[PDB]
Assembly symmetry: C2
């Protein structure tokens, strides 16, 4: 695998990691860990990220065989 564009997209929108974390009701450390590709979110958290960034999920998380 998964290519991960979360930091680029979040930054393009001038949304800080703290606001996004607050919207999602997760720790800022968890958003940072996802952005740094340390671990994957659940599907529901991924969908909530896409919802709050106003983009298709696949713009953020890309799987390729």
């Amino acid at each position: 695998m998964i290519i991960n564009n979360l930091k680029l997209i979040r930054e393009k929108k001038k949304i800080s990691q703290s606001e996004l974390a607050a919207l999602l009701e997760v720790s800022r450390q968890t958003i940072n860990g996802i952005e740094k590709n340390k671990y994957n979110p659940s599907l529901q958290l991924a969908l909530k990220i896409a919802y709050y960034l106003n983009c298709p999920l696949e713009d953020i998380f890309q799987w390729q065989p």
Copy 2:
């Protein structure tokens, strides 16, 4: 809460559960459990499903905003 449309999309495309399981390298039980709402797939499995069903992931898995 996620609502999914996997059964209807799969069936419209004339794909059986075993067929989809084979493509995705998961069990039929897994596919069936998603369709029966026993649980949500992982992010990776959801991305694979979207990749091969050739439609945006949110056509298949819809978070109900809350």
